[PDB]
Design an enzyme around this catalytic site. Structure first.
Site, PDB file in Angstrom:
ATOM      1  N   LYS A 158       6.087  -0.740   7.727  1.00  0.00           N
ATOM      2  CA  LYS A 158       6.902   0.116   6.900  1.00  0.00           C
ATOM      3  C   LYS A 158       8.304  -0.470   6.931  1.00  0.00           C
ATOM      4  CE  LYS A 158       3.934   4.127   6.935  1.00  0.00           C
ATOM      5  N   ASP A 189       5.315  14.850   7.449  1.00  0.00           N
ATOM      6  CA  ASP A 189       4.219  14.296   6.671  1.00  0.00           C
ATOM      7  C   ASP A 189       2.809  14.626   7.179  1.00  0.00           C
ATOM      8  OD1 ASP A 189       5.113  12.940   4.389  1.00  0.00           O
ATOM      9  OD2 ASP A 189       3.595  11.372   4.917  1.00  0.00           O
ATOM     10  N   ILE A 209       0.831  -1.212   0.000  1.00  0.00           N
ATOM     11  CA  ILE A 209       0.000   0.000   0.000  1.00  0.00           C
ATOM     12  C   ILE A 209       0.864   1.259   0.000  1.00  0.00           C
ATOM     13  CG2 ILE A 209      -2.058  -1.055   1.062  1.00  0.00           C
ATOM     14  CD1 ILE A 209      -1.260  -0.010   3.732  1.00  0.00           C
ATOM     15  N   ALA A 253       5.330   0.657   2.254  1.00  0.00           N
ATOM     16  CA  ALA A 253       4.312   0.202   3.215  1.00  0.00           C
ATOM     17  C   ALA A 253       3.496  -1.023   2.767  1.00  0.00           C
ATOM     18  CB  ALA A 253       3.378   1.339   3.581  1.00  0.00           C
TER      19      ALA A 253
HETATM   20 CL   LIG Z   1       1.778   5.570  10.830  1.00  0.00          CL
END
Ligand SMILES: [Cl-]
Ligand SMILES: [Cl-]
Ligand SMILES: [Cl-]
Ligand SMILES: [Cl-]
Length: 293
Positions: A42, A137, A25, A27
């Site tokens: 991750k 992020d 995805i 990840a």
């Molecule tokens: Cl996360």
């Protein structure tokens, strides 16, 4: 050991639990072989990191591993094997705010719904910023909904320090829409760069579009620097429209702090829906942090 280095592979683990890969995805959605519960892993390469990139990666994971807040995706564990680091996070079954926004198909959200989500994002960021941690992020693609509708900021992306050139680079390759003026001019990344990004997210929730768009990466940069964006619908309150404009001030130090956003009455009145009295006392009143230790 007969050379012209065996035993230098990093091995780290905290539990026996095994995860089955389901889907990409860096990840991966996985399922625990223990009880079928789903998680996100991750993967980060460690073998080709320098000694300095490794000491900083280590320090980042430690921070990730200690972060606990109801509006931050819960870290589960990490492990290292085969020259990679793997970080196991809970999976937010509601998906990300980016998909939720597109699911509207152009129908503007109610202001109450915007602000209820936004306050949660702000609470998450307060927690991160109070500790002098940055978040590279803050994006709709990295804010998620749990099964019961709670908003959670992705833990991944927290940073102890950021390089303005690297972030500019990452943006020209990945998503450029959250770039702050200062990063566009190669000036230092700071806490108010996060506030800009937070503003971009609020703008997305208000309009279902990005605030800054352009036909070329070089001209997007110039449009961000100019600070010129399509106004939010006048159907929204003056409080909300006013906040949007404050978050997009060109000079970082003119943007409000996240504490300052949360003290605004139309937002402050919502906090008690999301934190208990004990957490409110701890987050807002009692627990203090400083750039001095
Ligand atoms: Cl996360
Ligand atoms: Cl709505
Ligand atoms: Cl400034
Ligand atoms: Cl702040």
């Amino acid at each position: 050991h007969h050379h012209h280095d065996l035993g230098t592979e990093n091995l780290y683990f905290q539990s026996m639990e095994k995860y089955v890969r389901l889907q990409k995805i860096k990840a991966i959605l996985v399922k625990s072989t223990e009880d079928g519960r789903q998680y996100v892993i991750k993967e980060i390469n460690i073998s080709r990191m320098s000694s300095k990139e490794r000491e900083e990666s280590r320090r980042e994971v430690a921070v990730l591993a200690n972060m606990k807040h109801p509006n931050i995706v819960q870290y589960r564990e990490s492990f290292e094997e085969n020259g990679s680091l793997y970080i196991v996070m809970d999976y937010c079954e509601g998906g990300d705010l980016f998909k939720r926004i597109n699911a509207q198909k152009g129908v503007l959200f109610q202001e109450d719904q915007i602000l209820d989500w936004f306050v949660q994002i702000c609470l998450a960021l307060k927690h991160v910023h109070d500790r002098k941690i940055l978040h590279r992020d803050i994006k709709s693609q990295n804010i998620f909904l749990t099964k019961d509708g709670t908003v959670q900021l992705g833990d991944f992306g927290i940073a102890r320090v950021l390089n303005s050139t690297v972030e500019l680079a990452r943006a020209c390759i990945g998503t450029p829409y959250y770039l702050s003026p200062e990063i566009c001019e190669n000036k230092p990344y700071n806490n108010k760069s996060d506030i800009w990004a937070l503003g971009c997210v609020l703008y997305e929730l208000c309009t279902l579009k990005h605030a800054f768009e352009a036909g070329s990466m070089k001209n997007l940069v110039l449009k961000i620097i100019s600070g010129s964006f399509p106004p939010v619908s006048l159907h929204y309150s003056y409080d909300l429209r006013s906040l949007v404009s404050q978050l997009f001030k060109r000079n970082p130090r003119d943007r409000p702090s996240v504490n300052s956003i949360l003290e605004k009455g139309f937002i402050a009145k919502r906090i008690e829906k999301f934190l208990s009295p004990q957490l409110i006392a701890e987050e807002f009143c009692l627990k203090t942090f400083s750039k001095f230790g």
